[PDB]
Amino acid sequence: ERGWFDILDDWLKRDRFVFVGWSGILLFPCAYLALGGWLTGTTFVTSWYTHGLASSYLEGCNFLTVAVSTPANSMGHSLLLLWGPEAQGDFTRWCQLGGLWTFIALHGAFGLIGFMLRQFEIARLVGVRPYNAIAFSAPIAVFVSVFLIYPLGQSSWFFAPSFGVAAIFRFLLFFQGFHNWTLNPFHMMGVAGVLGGALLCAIHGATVENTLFQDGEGASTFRAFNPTQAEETYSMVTANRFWSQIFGIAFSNKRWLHFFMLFVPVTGLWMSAIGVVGLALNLRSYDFISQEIRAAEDPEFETFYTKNLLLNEGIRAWMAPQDQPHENFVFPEEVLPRGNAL
Amino acid sequence: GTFNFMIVFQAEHNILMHPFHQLGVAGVFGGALFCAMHGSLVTSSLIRETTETESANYGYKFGQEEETYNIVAAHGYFGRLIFQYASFNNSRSLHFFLAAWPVVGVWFAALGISTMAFNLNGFNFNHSVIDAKGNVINTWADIINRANLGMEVMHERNAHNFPLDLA
Amino acid sequence: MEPNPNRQPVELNRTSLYLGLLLILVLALLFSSYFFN
Amino acid sequence: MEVNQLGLIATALFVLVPSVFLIILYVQTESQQK
């Protein structure tokens, strides 16, 4: 066996500065197009016709406020292909209809697929276990749940996040006001996994850096390490005693420690993905029924929960007309919820 | 109550649009990313010391002198995943990075809260974009602004007698 | 009957017990509020 | 408060069932030969 397939395989898997692989054929064009599409849109493309927003440097937006915005609500869940029945091959009109959003989302998705496949391929070639790809399943679960499943459960791509800094912030505040997303225990697990992951990252880095063996004469200790050395560069035993005496418990097993470092943030993100899947259907943790029944009967009964619902109601009424222009909301001054003075 | 504090903070300082909070977010998202990454690479390069019918964790014994994974193989993988010089071959440098990114980022989050404490607030691009006549052209910042307005007007609905919330 | 050779013993060490109980109890403390609603 | 009247059993079994599973596994681990 030495046909064209194997020769191609040979070239694809050549050890070069940027590894290619079979996975590269999917990854590189899709990733390049996703990123390029984002830069192109944020630089030059408006959201006037889809959102009634400026979203490009061209219009005077800055890095924080630029976006590639979602299509109009009226587009529904159209793939919005350049050659599709909406744009009909017209690139300018395609840009004006928000075609770059689905362009970016879909090339982005296939690109993530390509990247994870890349992780598997390289892991296989180098002969390591494929835990990096497995861990990468969490970013994918997030992207898929948030940018695809969520809008698919809603009316249209319009309510997906727009690709932009401020737009993403808007997405956050929308989820608070409409979904009460902070109250959602899947989001809470997400938070625990992210902050817990950052904690583990920081604490592990610091612990290693502060239990180093003196392996050099230098006061700057980085050179006193050799990649090929057999010995542990830091003292597990001393670290273990330190945390045992400080915190009460400590790692004693490095393999467990690092698997745990994989487990915590990946699992967190996955839980958050599940919650967002719920939000696609508006299946929220919005309320505590017992709370509402009590508060309904007792106007002196107040918790931070009820206060937060007042905040949510404000968000909804004040932001909805401009945030959801397709609804043609007209909210008279007098219907707007407001406290005293403000 | 934590969520209340957060929503009101957004209303009053537009914290999301504050670069110290964005650095905070980079800090915790990044912290989680590198935690999972590091976890995954070290786990990926564990040296075979066990059989399939037992946990690989037993392949490491507490206090052993020899490292339990192959960092050269790990670096060989990650360096090919991106490119060679984007990968750490120095465990000490790597762990220093692991310590520093979330810690510095979170320091910025903290300083964000602590300086918005004195009302130096997030970026305000409200009506930053104007057409040739002078018509306001909304950006995503202005939609943020509308949400923020909802929050502002609704919070502590009985506490204000005067039109401006000055502290 | 002739014994099955595929049988393996199962183990849960104390640290794993503690970790599991922590997971379960903390999950319960989190979700219980929602179960009561 | 007008809580869900099944919340108690839901929470109780949620805690007890896997906790019991774990205790069974731990204890049968300890009793194996050293």
Binding site: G248 | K61, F62 | R14, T15, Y18, L29, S32 | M1, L8
Partner: peptide
Amino acid sequence: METITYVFIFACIIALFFFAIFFREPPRIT
């Protein structure tokens, strides 16, 4: 009954802290 449940779970968690700290399997150098 809700309150009892919440406080109970919390107390179980604290007791768990106690056992996990003072009655952990000791780390041993081989």
